[PDB]
Ligand binder design. Structure first.
Ligand SMILES: Nc1ccn([C@H]2C[C@H](O)[C@@H](COP(=O)(O)C(F)(F)P(=O)(O)OP(=O)(O)O)O2)c(=O)n1
Ligand SMILES: [Mn+2]
Ligand SMILES: [Mn+2]
Ligand code: NA
Ligand code: NA
Length: 325
DNA sequence: GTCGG
DNA sequence: GCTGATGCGC
DNA sequence: CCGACGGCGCATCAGC
């Protein structure tokens, strides 16, 4: 509400850069700008005022003035009314269709969902599921449903082996009232970095399939599964939307570093890493390691919980819900 | 497009 | 058939 | 003024 108009136009520009211009860094530049401006507690009155914020520079300051004055961006009005551009940008909303496939589809007259359905034979497996669940994939997941989704995965994993440890991370773990998808982190005492188990993820994915929880597969290997799941319907009522689910199998010795990382948020991760640095540690998704006087990173430290990582860098344990930043 | 080195 | 590159979505 | 900006796992392609 504060600066929704500006953050909207920045977002739109970001998407044009990513899907049409194929300029992924300008995509992140516009988004970062949109994020800082979104957290800013006043209604912006000039470009110069926005420029004081980290991530907003000369050109965004220039666009903000154009918008504050005239209500629009000449550059966006033009973009909206190029057929190629808006078609390419739209097609990218299909999972498995990125800038490259989108531009290629539009190049041969394929511009809409209708055209994709007419041309199924031109789509790879991932893209077909993306097309099939197009509306379902753009829908958020209420927290109430996340909880039922969690019960199902936790219990089914328990049934396969009591030694498995599974954690639902992402915004859900941070306490959000809605999530984009479900990201499951999985480990086993048998799986470490040192270790010689090409069936650990599989056992779990096939159990989820057997109880009809997982319905489709996007990609699946020995460490990562990406697919589609669905809550069982009432036996009476409206059947549930299909949801994206990801399952990652991580060595036990790197498991709590992974939980930390995949819980985020991004800015929290960024701040944590910076503080660690100041304390003589380098944290990444897999490990925390002591830094040497010359900057050389030592061996991975023993981590048996998330709290362990906070102790190393002398930070009071931060509740997931307090990791917005 | 914006940044820090 | 093999390998490394590219596209994709986290 | 300059290159960095995240980079990993998996699926498919490109070029032998
Ligand atoms: N492209 C990515 C995305 C994520 N992550 C890791 C690093 C991130 O800390 C973590 C979660 O990403 P997140 O914070 O964005 C999210 F999913 F939880 P949020 O979008 O905020 O909520 P919601 O799904 O409802 O839209 O995964 C990553 O390594 N690469
Ligand atoms: Mn600078
Ligand atoms: Mn440059
Ligand atoms: Na897409
Ligand atoms: Na070929």
């Amino acid at each position: 509400t504060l600066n929704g108009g500006i953050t909207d136009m920045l977002t739109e520009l970001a998407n044009f850069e990513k899907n049409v211009s194929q300029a992924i860094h300008k995509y992140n530049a516009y988004r970062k700008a949109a994020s800082v401006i979104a957290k800013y507690p006043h209604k912006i009155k000039s470009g110069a005022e926005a420029k004081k914020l980290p991530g907003v520079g000369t050109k965004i300051a220039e666009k903000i003035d154009e918008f504050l004055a005239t209500g629009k961006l000449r550059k966006l009005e033009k973009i909206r009314q190029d057929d190629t551009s808006s078609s390419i940008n739209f097609l990218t909303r299909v999972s498995g269709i990125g800038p490259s496939a989108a531009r290629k589809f539009v190049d041969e007259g394929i511009k809409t969902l209708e055209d994709l359905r007419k041309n199924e034979d031109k789509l790879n497996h991932h893209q077909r599921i993306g097309l099939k669940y197009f509306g379902d994939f753009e829908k958020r997941i209420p927290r109430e449903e996340m909880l039922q989704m969690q019960d199902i995965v936790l219990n089914e994993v328990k049934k396969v082996d009591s030694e498995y440890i599974a954690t639902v991370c992402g915004s859900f773990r941070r306490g959000a009232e809605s999530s984009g998808d479900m990201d499951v982190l999985l480990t086993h005492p048998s799986f470490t970095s040192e270790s010689t188990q090409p069936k650990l993820l599989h056992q779990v994915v096939e159990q989820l399939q057997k109880v009809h929880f997982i319905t489709d597969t996007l990609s699946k290997g020995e460490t990562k599964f990406m697919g589609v799941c669905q809550l069982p319907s009432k036996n009476d009522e409206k059947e549930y939307p299909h949801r994206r689910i990801d399952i990652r199998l991580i060595p036990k010795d790197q498991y709590y570093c992974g939980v930390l990382y995949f819980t985020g948020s991004d800015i929290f991760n960024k701040n944590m890493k910076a503080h660690a640095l100041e304390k003589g540690f380098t944290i990444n998704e897999y490990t925390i390691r002591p830094l040497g006087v010359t900057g050389v990173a030592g061996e991975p430290l023993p981590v048996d919980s998330e709290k362990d990582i906070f102790d190393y860098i002398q930070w009071k344990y931060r509740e997931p819900k307090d990791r917005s930043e």
